[PDB]
Write a protein that binds this ligand. Structure first.
Ligand SMILES: N[C@@H](CCC(=O)N[C@@H](CS[C@@H]1c2ccccc2-c2ccccc2[C@H]1O)C(=O)NCC(=O)O)C(=O)O
Ligand SMILES: N[C@@H](CCC(=O)N[C@@H](CS[C@@H]1c2ccccc2-c2ccccc2[C@H]1O)C(=O)NCC(=O)O)C(=O)O
Lengths: 217, 217
């Protein structure tokens, strides 16, 4: 079957794990362990980083038969082409392209806070930027069932993940945006997703490595 | 015409500027001025950031009639689709997807150094990581004229830009990689490219905004 390599955290791999499940993919994972500090040992990964035939070794990586891919969004796009989960029209394509890039920014923003040694001090100000971020997703989605428009697409998995992560971070952040709350429930209600969420494979936390200041365990 | 909006620096907009040129796109630009330190005033942008109908306001932005796009890779992909500069096969699409994301990472690493107050002290270690990055690119391209294969695609624009930046940063960095040196010289050689580089519109440097420790003017 296919192999997905990543750390044994949620990190940025949740959309891939969820899409492998939604597509009924035949896969197994390598969940690399990282030692405790000070070292935060990575040998488990580093012993084999350059022995996998990856063009640009990284985590996550996906091996599918002959094919070897890195870069979470490239993996996501490969799986979407594979299972016909791309935007179909130019309009859907541009909406998807924008969402894909926008989620990664909002993800980088959260990461930058969560790896800041001055976390608690920076938090209040980070929390203040949430309503603005959420408002932009809320308005973009509007009354659409999915981000692209009519059909679930791979960007719905990206959006689910980052919305959920912000929701975990600040539990009241969706209260003013019922459509986003509805979107999370609609996503979570997709048959294979609901079954996966209750399964032994599910990893909702920790989101970050032991290194982080938040969701590090 | 289309309108491209971005700061009055190269930043991450280079590939876009270059693709508009290559596609003989009819466009006008809005190059937003940023104040000097210690304030680095952003009022020229900030005055109309929320007045342009962008779903997720940002720089760069591209307006093409009713269509409004943000996210530099979504801009690139819109233009790519419009001019048939995407991968044509599954193999080409995967190569282009990985390159796209890989450039952004190599770009984010350069920014991470170049905005660090400890830039000078951090430089030794950064320089040490350079050969590894260049080797990956070199090996990936291999004998192909272009990153996706036999034909130019939009990812040649992204790769050209980051390789050039690295090269500007560390001049001797491509000495070992004739293929990289050759790819730069090949890209710069494209008619529309050669012309643009000599035009009134070209802005090679500064690479970064005034807030940076390097290529900030
Ligand atoms: N843009 C690429 C980025 C690939 C990349 O940086 N990989 C990380 C793991 S991802 C990392 C992480 C490591 C542990 C815990 C959490 C994260 C994480 C979470 C959210 C978002 C970014 C991150 C990141 O902090 C890694 O450990 N790489 C193998 C190595 O360097 O040898 C992508 O989209 O795939
Ligand atoms: N993923 C998104 C990234 C959009 C984004 O962050 N935009 C920056 C300008 S781009 C910024 C930058 C600003 C000035 C000069 C250089 C850059 C730059 C250069 C290399 C790499 C990243 C950067 C970035 O640090 C900006 O000023 N935004 C409007 C604002 O906040 O009101 C994209 O790919 O398009």
């Amino acid at each position: 079957p296919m192999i997905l390599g990543y750390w044994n955290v949620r990190g940025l791999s949740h959309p891939i794990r969820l899409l492998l499940e939604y597509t009924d993919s035949s896969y197994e994972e390598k969940r690399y362990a990282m030692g405790d500090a000070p070292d935060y040992d990575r040998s488990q990964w580093l012993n084999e980083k350059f022995k996998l035939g990856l063009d640009f070794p990284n985590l996550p990586y996906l091996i599918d038969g002959s094919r070897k891919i890195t870069q979470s969004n490239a993996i996501m796009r490969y799986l979407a082409r594979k299972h016909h989960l791309c935007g179909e029209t130019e309009e859907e394509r541009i909406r998807a392209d924008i969402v894909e890039n926008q989620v990664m920014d909002n993800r980088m923003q959260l990461i930058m806070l969560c790896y800041n040694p001055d976390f608690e001090k920076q938090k209040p100000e980070f929390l203040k930027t949430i309503p603005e971020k959420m408002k932009l997703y809320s308005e973009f989605l509007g009354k659409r069932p999915w981000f692209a428009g009519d059909k679930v697409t791979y960007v719905d998995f990206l959006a689910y993940d980052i919305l959920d992560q912000y929701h975990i971070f600040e539990p009241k952040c969706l209260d003013a945006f019922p459509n986003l709350k509805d979107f999370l429930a609609r996503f979570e209600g997709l048959k294979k997703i609901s079954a996966y969420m209750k399964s032994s494979r599910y990893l909702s936390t920790p989101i970050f490595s032991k290194l982080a200041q938040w969701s590090n365990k």
